[PDB]
């Protein structure tokens, strides 16, 4: 596999270059219209995520079915960590799109969304107080893609070790002590447990919106949702 022969700097450059673009939403808010804007946004982001996944080193080396499984398990996690990343410099708000920035009061427009909203805000505030770097973020997002669907595999684990090497290589590059390196490595990966929790809460919420038949869901978004039931 070509990914294992990459250096740490080559790994950072490969992940930064594959970053998907930031998309816009359609140019006050009900529950049905706010849900439509977000599912429309998520549907267009999924097309770019799949092409981002192809460019994560080591992901092409898996079979087609293994790629489908890793994306099916992790797509909402990847959307969520992308949302909390670009919401960092907006404390107390969620930057879904540059023309779609929401606060907690907007979360109460749709039921059952208050809890997930506050969880996303908390994760974003956590990243802000940790001064998460873009090089660290792209490593964390790739880890989610390869890890979340790994049980549910030896090559994936070798690539996961390679990304851990890259995370440590970035922290020692920023001057952190040996002790600060593994402490920061632990803090970052413990966030991934909560991103998983938020994704599972968000998946149940999307299912109820499918069952309430309130908003039109795309066939692709429905197939990703269907893979979790």
């Amino acid at each position: 596999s070509l990914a294992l022969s990459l250096t740490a700097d080559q790994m950072v450059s490969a992940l930064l270059d594959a970053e998907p673009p930031i998309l816009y939403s359609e140019y006050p808010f009900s529950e049905a219209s706010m849900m439509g804007l977000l599912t429309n946004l998520a549907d267009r982001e999924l097309v770019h995520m799949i092409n981002w996944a192809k460019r994560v080193p080591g992901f092409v080396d898996l079979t087609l079915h293994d790629q489908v499984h890793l994306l099916e398990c992790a797509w909402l996690e990847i959307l969520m960590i992308g949302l909390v990343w670009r919401s960092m410099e907006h404390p107390g708000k969620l930057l879904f799109a540059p023309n779609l920035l929401l606060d907690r009061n907007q979360g109460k427009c749709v039921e059952g969304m208050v809890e997930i909203f506050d969880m996303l805000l908390a994760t974003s505030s956590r990243f802000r107080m940790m001064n998460l770097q873009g090089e660290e973020f792209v490593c964390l997002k790739s880890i989610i893609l390869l890890n979340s669907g790994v049980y549910t595999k030896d090559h994936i684990h070798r690539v996961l070790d390679k990304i851990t090497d890259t995370l440590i290589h970035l922290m020692a590059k920023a001057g952190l002590t040996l002790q600060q390196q593994h402490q920061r490595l632990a803090q970052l990966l413990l966030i991934l447990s909560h991103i998983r929790h938020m994704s599972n809460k968000g998946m149940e919420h999307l299912y109820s919106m499918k069952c309430k038949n309130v908003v039109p869901l795309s066939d692709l978004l429905l197939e990703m949702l269907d893979a979790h039931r």
């Binding site: 799949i50 092409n51 996944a53 489908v68 066939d219 692709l220 197939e223 990703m224």
Partner: peptide, 10 residues
């Protein structure tokens, strides 16, 4: 049948 199959091959 899986749209995700198509997008991963395009």
């Amino acid at each position: 049948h899986k749209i995700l199959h198509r997008l991963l091959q395009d």
